[PDB]
Design an enzyme around this catalytic site. Structure first.
Site, PDB file in Angstrom:
ATOM      1  CE1 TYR A  80      68.626  50.187  84.856  1.00  0.00           C
ATOM      2  CE2 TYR A  80      66.741  49.753  83.424  1.00  0.00           C
ATOM      3  CZ  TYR A  80      68.107  49.847  83.620  1.00  0.00           C
ATOM      4  OH  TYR A  80      68.928  49.567  82.571  1.00  0.00           O
TER       5      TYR A  80
ATOM      6  CG  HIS B  18      74.821  56.354  87.750  1.00  0.00           C
ATOM      7  ND1 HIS B  18      74.191  57.039  86.741  1.00  0.00           N
ATOM      8  CD2 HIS B  18      76.043  56.909  87.878  1.00  0.00           C
ATOM      9  CE1 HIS B  18      75.024  57.920  86.229  1.00  0.00           C
ATOM     10  NE2 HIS B  18      76.151  57.873  86.912  1.00  0.00           N
TER      11      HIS B  18
HETATM   12  O1  LIG Z   1      69.304  55.911  82.228  1.00  0.00           O
HETATM   13  C1  LIG Z   1      70.100  55.171  82.773  1.00  0.00           C
HETATM   14  C2  LIG Z   1      71.153  54.441  81.977  1.00  0.00           C
HETATM   15  O2  LIG Z   1      71.197  54.955  80.631  1.00  0.00           O
HETATM   16  C3  LIG Z   1      72.499  54.664  82.681  1.00  0.00           C
HETATM   17  O3  LIG Z   1      73.512  53.885  81.971  1.00  0.00           O
HETATM   18  C4  LIG Z   1      72.449  54.172  84.139  1.00  0.00           C
HETATM   19  C5  LIG Z   1      71.356  54.943  84.929  1.00  0.00           C
HETATM   20  O4  LIG Z   1      71.766  56.305  84.915  1.00  0.00           O
HETATM   21  C6  LIG Z   1      71.223  54.479  86.401  1.00  0.00           C
HETATM   22  O5  LIG Z   1      71.515  53.286  86.703  1.00  0.00           O
HETATM   23  O6  LIG Z   1      70.726  55.296  87.192  1.00  0.00           O
HETATM   24  C7  LIG Z   1      69.957  54.884  84.271  1.00  0.00           C
HETATM   25  C8  LIG Z   1      69.274  53.515  84.405  1.00  0.00           C
HETATM   26  C9  LIG Z   1      67.839  53.523  83.895  1.00  0.00           C
HETATM   27  C10 LIG Z   1      67.500  53.107  82.603  1.00  0.00           C
HETATM   28  F1  LIG Z   1      68.483  52.693  81.804  1.00  0.00           F
HETATM   29  C11 LIG Z   1      66.189  53.131  82.155  1.00  0.00           C
HETATM   30  F2  LIG Z   1      65.870  52.716  80.921  1.00  0.00           F
HETATM   31  C12 LIG Z   1      65.187  53.578  83.001  1.00  0.00           C
HETATM   32  F3  LIG Z   1      63.915  53.601  82.612  1.00  0.00           F
HETATM   33  C13 LIG Z   1      65.496  53.993  84.269  1.00  0.00           C
HETATM   34  F4  LIG Z   1      64.534  54.465  85.068  1.00  0.00           F
HETATM   35  C14 LIG Z   1      66.821  54.011  84.692  1.00  0.00           C
HETATM   36  F5  LIG Z   1      67.102  54.403  85.937  1.00  0.00           F
END
Ligand SMILES: O=C1[C@@H](O)[C@H](O)C[C@](O)(C(=O)O)[C@@H]1Cc1c(F)c(F)c(F)c(F)c1F
Ligand SMILES: O=C1[C@@H](O)[C@H](O)C[C@](O)(C(=O)O)[C@@H]1Cc1c(F)c(F)c(F)c(F)c1F
Ligand SMILES: O=C1[C@@H](O)[C@H](O)C[C@](O)(C(=O)O)[C@@H]1Cc1c(F)c(F)c(F)c(F)c1F
Ligand SMILES: O=C(O)c1ccc(O)c(O)c1Cc1c(F)c(F)c(F)c(F)c1F
Ligand SMILES: [Cl-]
Ligand SMILES: [Cl-]
Ligand code: NA
Lengths: 140, 143
Positions: free
Chosen positions: B23, B100
């Site tokens: 990420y 996202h």
């Molecule tokens: O929180 C989430 C995921 O649960 C979601 O499926 C995609 C999501 O919304 C995205 O790609 O922006 C995001 C991805 C994601 C994470 F999955 C996460 F564990 C983080 F620490 C983080 F900063 C993050 F951006």
């Protein structure tokens, strides 16, 4: 050297600006080409912007982008939910692929799962936003 | 000037600390500053808020609805799991852009789909944290 970006528009996009301007906007495909070329040039990119209603022509362009490791911005138009061949050809790209749709198709693209990313619903500006991503994420 | 609400849901507070190889290394706090800088540049004001609480997110969305302010929303862990969030967003009159960081269509979509996508103005996925900045540019050009 300036980064070559291929911007490929599929079936229906030829009618952009003419068909249902109240839904997809008043900008024609010719004007879109000029706008994309201008904005790319400002960013140090060379946009090669093309439209075809022919699946074979689209595959042919994608294959050349694959071999050349050039990024692609793809709006498959009418082929978005139908052409497995496009999906299969795009799976062979070795530079980023940005899928773009003018309208919010969500209101099951074959392409989305294999693209680097996707921009939908943001109008023709979506193409420009894709350029700006590529300018920052692909080097020369 | 225009006030834009960037709302980040669960997991996003761990940005830059959790799986930075996936990420990114930029923290949520750093993301706020990047967003603020870009909004200054574009002539917008941006308010950036993050919470792991669904109830908190709902309150912020209702407030954006009453204020008629645009929303950039990354529902985070609520993306595939909160009908309430979609219902709240359905009451927004100003544009709603779903963002996202990761390409959610590539990672984990077998059955589940984003609740928000059908009612959003538009959606940007898979473009990393730049997706937030891109959404701001859209908003600047559109009001
Ligand atoms: O929180 C989430 C995921 O649960 C979601 O499926 C995609 C999501 O919304 C995205 O790609 O922006 C995001 C991805 C994601 C994470 F999955 C996460 F564990 C983080 F620490 C983080 F900063 C993050 F951006
Ligand atoms: O050709 C299509 C649709 O078949 C596709 O589902 C969405 C789509 O790819 C998009 O929103 O970009 C595109 C939408 C669309 C059209 F559906 C259409 F008939 C046009 F004339 C047009 F210019 C246009 F952009
Ligand atoms: O297929 C080609 C080239 O072989 C040709 O030299 C130019 C060309 O005919 C044109 O400018 O329209 C076309 C250029 C071209 C590509 F070379 C390419 F890799 C594409 F992805 C693409 F979309 C594209 F349009
Ligand atoms: O059409 C197929 O079923 C298929 C079967 C075996 C393959 O090795 C194969 O590549 C395909 C075609 C195919 C893709 F090329 C691809 F990129 C996919 F993502 C995919 F799901 C697929 F299935
Ligand atoms: Cl732009
Ligand atoms: Cl940007
Ligand atoms: Na410009």
């Amino acid at each position: 050297s300036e980064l070559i970006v291929n911007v490929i528009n599929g079936p229906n996009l030829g009618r952009l600006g003419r068909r249902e301007p109240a839904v997809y906007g008043g900008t024609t495909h010719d004007e879109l080409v000029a706008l994309i070329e201008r904005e790319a040039a400002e960013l140090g990119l060379k946009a090669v912007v093309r439209q075809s209603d022919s699946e074979a022509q689209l595959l042919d362009w994608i294959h050349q982008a694959a071999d050349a490791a050039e990024p692609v911005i793809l709006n498959a138009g009418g082929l978005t939910h139908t052409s497995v061949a496009l999906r299969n050809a795009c799976a062979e790209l070795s530079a980023p692929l940005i899928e773009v749709h003018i309208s919010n198709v969500h209101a099951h693209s074959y392409l989305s799962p294999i693209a680097t990313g996707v921009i939908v619903g943001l109008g023709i500006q979506g193409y420009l936003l894709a350029l700006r991503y590529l300018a920052e994420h692909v080097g020369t």
